[PDB]
Amino acid sequence: APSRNGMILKPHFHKDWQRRVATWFNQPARKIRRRKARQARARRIAPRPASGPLRPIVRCPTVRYHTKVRAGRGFSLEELRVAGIHKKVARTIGISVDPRRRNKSTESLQANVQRLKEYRSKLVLFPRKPSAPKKGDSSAEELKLATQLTGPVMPIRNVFKKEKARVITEEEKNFKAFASLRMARANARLFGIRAKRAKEAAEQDVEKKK
Amino acid sequence: PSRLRKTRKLRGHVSHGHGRIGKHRKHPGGRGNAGGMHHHRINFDKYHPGYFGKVGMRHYHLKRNQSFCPTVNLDKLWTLVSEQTRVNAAKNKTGAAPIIDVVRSGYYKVLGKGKLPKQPVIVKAKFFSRRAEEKIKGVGGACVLVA
RNA sequence: GUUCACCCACUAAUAGGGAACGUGAGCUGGGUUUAGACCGUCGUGAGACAGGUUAGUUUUACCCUACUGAUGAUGUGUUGU
RNA sequence: CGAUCCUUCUGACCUUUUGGGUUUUAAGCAGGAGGUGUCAGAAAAGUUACCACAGGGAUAACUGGCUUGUGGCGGCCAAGC
RNA sequence: UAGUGACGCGCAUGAAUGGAUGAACGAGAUUCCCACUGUCCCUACCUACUAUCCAGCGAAACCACAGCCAAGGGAACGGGCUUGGCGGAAUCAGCGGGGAAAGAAGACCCUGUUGAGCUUGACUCUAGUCUGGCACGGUGAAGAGACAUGUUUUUUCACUGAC
RNA sequence: UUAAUUAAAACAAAGCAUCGCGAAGGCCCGCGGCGGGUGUUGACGCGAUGUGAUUUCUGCCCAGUGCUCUGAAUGUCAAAG
RNA sequence: GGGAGCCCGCCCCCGGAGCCCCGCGGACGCUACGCCGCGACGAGUAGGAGGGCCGCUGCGGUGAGCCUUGAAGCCUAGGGCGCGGGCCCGGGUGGAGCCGCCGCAGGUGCAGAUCUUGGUGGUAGUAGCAAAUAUUCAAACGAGAACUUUGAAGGCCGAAGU
RNA sequence: GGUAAGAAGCCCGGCUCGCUGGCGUGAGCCGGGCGUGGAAUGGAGUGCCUAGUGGGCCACUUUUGGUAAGCAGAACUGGCG
RNA sequence: GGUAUAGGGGCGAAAGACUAAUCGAACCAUCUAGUAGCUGGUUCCCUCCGAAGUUUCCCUCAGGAUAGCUGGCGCUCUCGC
RNA sequence: GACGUCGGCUACCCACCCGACCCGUCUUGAAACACGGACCAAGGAGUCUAACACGUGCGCGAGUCGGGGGCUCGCACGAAAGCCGCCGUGGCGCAAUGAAGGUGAAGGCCGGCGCGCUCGCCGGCCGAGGUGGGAUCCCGAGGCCUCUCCAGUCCGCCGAGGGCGCACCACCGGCCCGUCUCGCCCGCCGCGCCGGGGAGGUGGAGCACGAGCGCACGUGUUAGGACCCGAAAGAUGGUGAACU
RNA sequence: CGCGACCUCAGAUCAGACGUGGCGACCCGCUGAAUUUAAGCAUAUUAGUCAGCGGAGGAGAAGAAACUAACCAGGAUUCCCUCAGUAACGGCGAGUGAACAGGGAAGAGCCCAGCGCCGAAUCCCCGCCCCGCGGCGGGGCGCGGGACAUGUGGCGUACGGAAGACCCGCUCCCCGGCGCCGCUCGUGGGGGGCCCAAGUCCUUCUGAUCGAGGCCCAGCCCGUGGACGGUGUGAGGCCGGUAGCGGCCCCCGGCGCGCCGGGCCCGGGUCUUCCCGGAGUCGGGUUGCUUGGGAAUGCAGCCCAAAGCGGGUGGUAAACUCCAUCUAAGGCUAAAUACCGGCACGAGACCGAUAGUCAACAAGUACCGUAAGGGAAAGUUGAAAAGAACUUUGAAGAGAGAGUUCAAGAGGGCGUGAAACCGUUAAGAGGUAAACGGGUGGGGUCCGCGCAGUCCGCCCGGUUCAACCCGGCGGCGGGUCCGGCCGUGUCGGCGGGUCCCCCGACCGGCGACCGGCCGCCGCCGGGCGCAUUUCCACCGCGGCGGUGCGCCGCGACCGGCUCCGGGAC
């Protein structure tokens, strides 16, 4: 029963929720178990990075964000081909590869290629056997650093480019942002109608001749 | 704390603070929002007007990301940039007019609320209001559209 | 079944009433008033009838008081007359 | 003389119909109508004597309470038997 | 005011929702007569077993506190209150006036937006049943309507290879 | 015949009269099956009713509600075509 | 500061003027969530609020806490305090843990619910130990005999039987 | 039963008006001058959270139905609750 | 004695009779701590304030909502200064 | 008055006078011939979670936050505590109004250019308006004085009167969005069924120099078993023909 | 009229293996309601929930797009936060209710059919030899069989593939055995077994100390050990243990080195030629259930029923037209995930025997019902049985003595032993049932006095040192800021937006500190010998204050009342 201006609410407690209440008293134990498993995996892969395979530079859909840069699922096949890295060899070297990614713009492709180049530049490849074969790095850069890399390997940081103060001209002063926006919206709305009217006018023009 | 709760002061009182002419029955008025039209219509019409009835157009697969568009007023515009940027303004005898990127600060549309200081500035944003553009032009800046 | 009611006979007279419309751990259960049935009216029907008929378990006092009886009881020093 | 929801009609060079464009359709805004007579607006036939449960002396069938219309009984005046 | 025989004016008898009759029969319901007797007039006496007392063994219901009455008021019939009548230890055998005695959160009546059994011309439906359409579902022979200038509807008669 | 309030006028009974069915059937059971009971059966049989020994009869009414009959002479008539 | 008044000069400091005000320092009164002074008021169901140095249990701090020279608990015709919830001592039993203060937490206070469990009263040495005829005498064992056993007498079930 | 018993009131001067008018109204703006506006008593105003209650009864006076009612139903005030 | 029929089912010479002391729908367990506008109960002290059975709406009349009555928290100010 | 005499308000028993009907509950009305009640001991009924609303306390403050995760420990004390380019992905608030396409919160004064046209365009200035009531603060004439007359800077109290006027209330204006009416002009990459602007009414949970976020506590309302006990019923799955 | 192949189909106690059932906390596939809410009730809600059926593991399921999105795009599945109580569904009522993106935990990808190339190049079974055999393998020898051409194996699968040309660089991966060196993180991996510090020290209580006091420094010794339990109380040191990158003896696991038997002649980029897709399936109508999915989200019986620049999706039905994104009708896969059952552990602001699981104990036991099923009550002597020898009454149960124990005033259902109720002793009382409140009185229980209680506490009268100096020590306050530090605000060296040093000046000189100076106070040691000084006692009730052991009496003043006698206007 309502009483003197209370908020109208509908609690969703009409089912047998007490039977399906999920407590969280195991949260610290779960965190400890995950930490122990992570440390065990890090000790398992002694020279390999703790975080794991390298992740590519990826932008976001859903124009809500439209600007944030995050880690991708894996490097695209075209990016690997441009960088000169075989897709199967990349998995064994520690490069995340997914075969579903597309490449529409050149900027992302070039950024990922540069990232792969930098990773191969700062990659130390241990030989299969103690006697170093071809493509194995020298023993000089093996004793100095045989430890893991904490955190993500080459972390992605969203960086913005600073713009210096300009000399704003009369044209930029006379630019009409609101009017341009309204005109563009109107043109987008009426583009099809204008085309239909043009088609009808052309039909009338060709009918006049006949 | 039950020590501070009211139930400790009601020990010894027969009705326990719920009347004796009419006992505290289980559900006299109805469970939940029962009787929105009947026997609670007075309350529902004097405290929640517009509760019953439909209005507007349905939108099946609505996405908040499509309509996401945060707004910032000219009242707080120089707060997006560092204070030294405004210090290096109205100075140097050059007319620097620094650029403030609204999209970088996290807003898409710039609104015209508030008073803008007499200092030229280049405002880059996806959308602009007419009054905000007028204020910027009067101050001596320029509105820049970005995608 | 009756309260009521009428008649027969006697007689001074067969006057009128109350007591939780006296009186069911006092009695009877005759008819109201469970369940089974029959008849007539009403209802399509299940069923209804201050409309009739028949058969249909009447539990307990040893408690307190009241009453009928029986020992008794405080005083007269004790008993008896 | 009539709320919600639904249907129907009228009006905008009205909005959406979802990746864009055109046309049917549909969903929208505003103004009327279709009706809720239990009329602030449930969609709704009976019986139970085979009955059941939570309650009421707020509410009936007994007695007892106020009153005496009615029933019974008794006076006052006096046209007359 | 009952029982039996005739009258029909039948609130509201009546013909297989059967009417009338009817030998025998009925732990079926009523009226009268003979005999019989304590049903009664009108109660009395006798016997056995209890009830009584004693030895032994020994519960239960019920229990606000407890129990003498007249009147008054009260919530409208008091064991308690008021005014009076009065009252004296502990008990035994009866007794049924009172404790509005004990029992079952009244069977009657009403309320509940509580139900259940049953009925139907109540509101929604459902098994079942009838009919129409599609598939299993084929082969042969004729014929007709319609469209139109080959198509469909196909009606009938035959075969079994499905069933 | 209502064990535990109703032994009856109630139920049942032979007798009497209707109704469906000739087996890919009548009645009925079954979520289901080339299922099952009648049926180890065939109209003098099975299934569904009404009244309830013998005698004498069984009057009139199809308006109403049922049941049943045929009928491209046909108003309504869903899906499919 | 100047001019003067009903010959000039002082007219002074509380480490001391001694006090009904002393502005030089200031309680016996200052747990300032404390203390002190005036007035007015005090009914109460349903109900609300405030204070509990009222009470039960456990936890974090704290009483150089209590305790086998005696803890909790229980009883009391003893001394008391608080309006009150309740609390502090004395005595007796008891034998091993308990409490005060500052905060926290709760399965935290019973006279009723025909309340749940358990125990005990009046009734009450009361109702009752009454369906189917019936027992008696003597002896034995035995501490103990109406009920057992033996012997005798009288009976019943009366072959669809006890 | 409503009002008025003064500062939120009077007297001037000047502006505005797309309203109204022959000039004028009428309203709104600014500047200046004038204070105990009848009696008696009270310190006032304002904003939120909000339990319980929504069965009443009685009495002076007025009064509806009823013959009357310790009857049913109203008006002011006061009580029990 | 054996066997067959098992609960909206069985069986019934039909009484709503029997179906393990229960039958107008058996027993056990679970949903289930089913719902109740209806009964009953609701646990320590002191202090202060302290009510209503009235408005309108509701298939509303033993109940709710809404105002009213009430408590608490305050806040804005005036002053025996 | 002091070896069988004192005081013990309270509690043990008894007597007297007055008052005094048994508790809880429903009820206008209970001691009731209304209901529960022999007695005693133990247990016993407003809890917890979630969503809100208001008030209070604390921290930060146009910001606030730790949800989740990660880095320190082998857990006594610890499943605690500290820290994070995670410090903010994300929630709330800082912007609202329309069904939506969308739009989206400031003006005023002065000089000039168009005819000041209550309209448009160029520069400068002030920069959240005004009235009334407004706790407080400022100026404050003058008075009160001081052992004598004058002059006189200082410590004061009162101070008529005059002002800036917090918070808050009433009103007048102003601004944003939707809608209605009358109307005149602006711009071009595409001169169009384009876009923008004015005045006058109206609707909004809006702006008008902000107040929110997190935690804790108290009360009230709900969903949950929901202060405790209580049904007649309904459904699912199994067991009974040893009685009948 | 027979024999010999093949396709379909039976018999075997034929040879060798496999499934059945149970548990079921978590999971998967079906079926599946009603109590309840809507104040009634029928759609809805409860709810894909209870009940019922089937199937496995340590996890299961899902899983690498016929995806999400419309952006400058992301890229398997699973879980947490958020999206969000939102879009959406609903007698649009009650109520129901996702997904995208973003941030994290984890992260691993792949394999067939088809198309095609290779002499079926493949696989199974039986015999012999060698290794080894307690999760039956590897090699060799068998004109020994079978399966397979109605298709096994290698390459190869959408991310393209295959075959040639000829550019580049070169030659390790795995399996089955035989051994060997390092005891491999809770800091020695897992399991088992045995051990590792310090008072029973001196007094004192007790029945018994683990109590109390003391012991070269809170006390004696150890302490990387001061958790816990037992022992006749409350124990770091009496014992077991506890701590420890402490010690010793065995078994197992994996990570590494040597040897044997082997299998294995395994690449990347450019160019040329070919190839590349799962059918009664998608889809359409339909109806039923479900979903937020709304002109139909998903699952489906029935009917129709495909195509290949094709098909699906793009959250409003249809037509036309461009786009964006995947490749369904085949399959495998750990991780972050859940776990009221099972094995073994740790912990608690939880209950402490009417509480906590029904069950602390011979508990699903006794017992009840024919059965499905229902289901209790029940802990405590004592440190140690030392559990009462023996005498005596009685047939015995039961007592009376005696004895053990600190205690039977603990005596085998025995710790503490309350209330209701009952028996007995002591006191009091008793004809208006009992009982209660207010006011007294009487009798008892003890309590506090006293063998007078006149309660004291200050001032005054009738053995040494203050007074006053010397030396030492300590303390307080103060200014010339005296001198140095310290310290706040400003000015200065720019000396090293926020953060540090120097001298000079002013101000607040702030309790932020010192060295000298002064004044004062206190203590110790010396003088100071007695008109001062301080003690003990008495005769004064002399001055002051609260008080009297109990019972009282009287006087004066005031306040509040009820009265009386007068005089005068």
Offer a quick outline of the entry:
Chain B: Belongs to the universal ribosomal protein uL15 family. Chain B: GO terms for molecular function: structural constituent of ribosome. The structure is cut from a larger assembly and holds chains A (210 residues) and B (147 residues). Chain A is an all-alpha fold.
List the helices and strands of chain A in order.
Answer: HEEHHHHHH
Q: What characteristic shape of chain B results from the CA principal axes?
A: elongated
Report the portion of residues of chain A in β strands. under 5%
Fraction in helix of chain B: 10-25%
**In angstroms, what separates the terminal alpha carbons of chain A?**
79 Å
Strand portion of chain B: 5-15%
| Helical residue percent band of chain A | 40-55%
**Number of DSSP strands of chain A?**
2
User: How large is the count of helical segments of chain B?
Assistant: 5
Structural class of chain A: mainly alpha
Radius of gyration of chain A: 30 Å
Modified residues (Phosphoserine) (chain B): 67
Biased composition (Basic residues) (chain B): 1-29
Function (chain B): Component of the large ribosomal subunit. The ribosome is a large ribonucleoprotein complex responsible for the synthesis of proteins in the cell.
Pfam family, one (chain B): Ribosomal_L27A
